[PDB]
Design a protein around this ligand. Structure first.
Ligand SMILES: O=c1c(O)c(-c2ccc(O)cc2)oc2cc(O)cc(O)c12
Length: 446
């Protein structure tokens, strides 16, 4: 019989959502070389992933609209382009299906989609194929979408530090950690926020939900709770397969620089590429780093150099590196790095915990607040920066706590324990090995 298995894949076609889904598809394509995988992105998302990159023969890339009509210039805010893409609806997605079917000469048998592309469920239902939702965000935030009314009520009535005890396994989460998007009502609501708020109804319709994380690190009650809500909950190890990686020149000599430093002595600072930090916090970060005296590597966008204190880079040049880019995977795996100062983006956190690096957290956006809370109060492998925003005195205190003080020993010890848990999780007997096989059979059975 001719193999006619054909998986269509819809990323959420924006930055941090792209590599984790390609990573998963690469793994699936390698184990099932007789199966077609059709990756459907926008021109900009395809450029982002596939420019420098060779892909296996059974992965083909197709392009659909980004929802930005020619001539339009989106405002400088991180939600507009998301709304515009989501507004293109299932018909834009079906144009992708058409291209994939025409090239492969095979009807689609299964869809894998980033959970945020909820229109792809309608597409799957129209084709009568299974819909597999992919979750590359903070694993724990899944629970929020099944409890929106309780969360809104508590956030409106209760104290800011009140705990969300109604979420099994997640009683450490607080009102103040909740994504603002899920609370906004009226004019503040966006197509993006409305889409996220529909996840409680959308996700149980998925044949399986695939979580890009380590099941062994999530609270067991949370995992049980999610299993009770979904048809199938599968964890696939988020670590990069070799084909995802693109060999890169360490232009700034980060690793060599780190080689000259003592074990667990260096602060690696990176606060993301999606929301601009308030300039006053950028200044605060610089002042604290300089005053702390600790060695540091700060990955900072070029456009922010002009707001750093005059002479800061020059005065710290003998103990710090302020650079536009670092090979973060390699930096976080370097033994010299003793703390990761982070906005708590999901992939950053994944890399930090898998390498045993404790964190100082300043969540800015989305579910970063959930991640920060899990890091501090559940895993206990870090702290939310003293003050909840970067200040010179507060950040200096957090740096000392984690890097040098005996009071930070528990956190340092916990980071090593969590690293060992991850190492055993990605092993041949971890849950994920079985869950990956389960996913493969869903695709082969479709
Ligand atoms: O996980 C999330 C995520 O990735 C993004 C995002 C925003 C802009 C981008 O360009 C790319 C992603 O927003 C979010 C907003 C939330 O309220 C909750 C979340 O969990 C996310």
């Amino acid at each position: 019989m001719k193999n006619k298995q054909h998986v269509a894949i819809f990323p959420f076609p924006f930055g941090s959502h792209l590599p984790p889904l390609l990573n998963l598809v690469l793994k699936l394509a390698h184990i099932a070389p007789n199966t077609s995988f059709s990756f459907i992105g926008t021109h900009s998302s395809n450029a982002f992933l596939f420019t420098k990159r060779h892909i296996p023969n059974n992965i083909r890339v197709f392009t659909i609209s980004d929802g930005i009509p020619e001539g339009h210039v989106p405002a400088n805010n991180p939600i507009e382009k998301l709304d515009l893409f989501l507004s293109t609806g299932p018909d834009n997605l079906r144009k992708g299906i058409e291209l994939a079917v025409a090239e492969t000469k095979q009807s689609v048998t299964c869809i894998i989609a980033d959970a945020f592309v909820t229109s792809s469920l309608l597409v799957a239902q129209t084709l009568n194929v299974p819909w597999i939702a992919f979750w590359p965000n903070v694993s724990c935030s899944l629970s929020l979408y099944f409890n929106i009314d309780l969360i809104r009520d508590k956030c409106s009535k209760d104290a800011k530090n009140a705990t969300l005890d109604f979420l099994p396994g997640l009683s450490k989460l607080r009102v103040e950690d909740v994504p603002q998007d899920m609370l906004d009502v009226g004019e503040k609501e966006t197509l993006f926020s409305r889409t996220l708020n529909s996840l409680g109804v959308v996700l149980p319709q998925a044949k399986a939900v695939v979580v890009n994380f380590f099941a062994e690190l999530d609270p067991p009650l949370f995992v049980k709770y999610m299993r009770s809500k979904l048809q199938s909950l599968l964890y696939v190890v988020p670590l990069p397969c070799p084909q995802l990686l693109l060999p890169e020149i360490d232009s700034n000599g980060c690793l060599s620089w780190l080689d000259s430093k003592s074990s667990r002595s260096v602060a690696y600072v990176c606060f993301g590429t999606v929301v601009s930090p308030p300039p006053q916090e950028v200044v605060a970060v610089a002042e604290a780093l300089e005053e702390s005296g600790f060695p540091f590597v700060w990955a900072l966008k070029e456009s922010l150099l002009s707001i750093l204190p005059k002479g800061f880079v020059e005065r710290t040049s003998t103990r710090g590196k302020v650079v536009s880019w670092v090979p973060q995977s390699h930096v976080l795996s370097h033994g010299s790095v003793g703390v990761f100062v982070t906005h708590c983006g999901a992939n950053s956190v994944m890399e930090s915990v898998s390498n045993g690096v404790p964190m100082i957290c300043r969540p800015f956006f989305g579910d970063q607040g959930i991640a920060a809370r899990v890091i501090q109060d559940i895993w206990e492998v870090g702290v939310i920066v003293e003050g909840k925003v970067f200040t010179k005195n507060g950040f200096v205190k957090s740096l000392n706590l984690i890097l040098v003080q005996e009071d930070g020993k528990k956190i340092r010890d916990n980071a090593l324990k969590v690293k060992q848990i991850v190492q055993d999780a990605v092993g041949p007997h971890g849950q994920a090995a079985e869950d990956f096989n389960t996913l493969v059979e869903v695709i082969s059975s479709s």
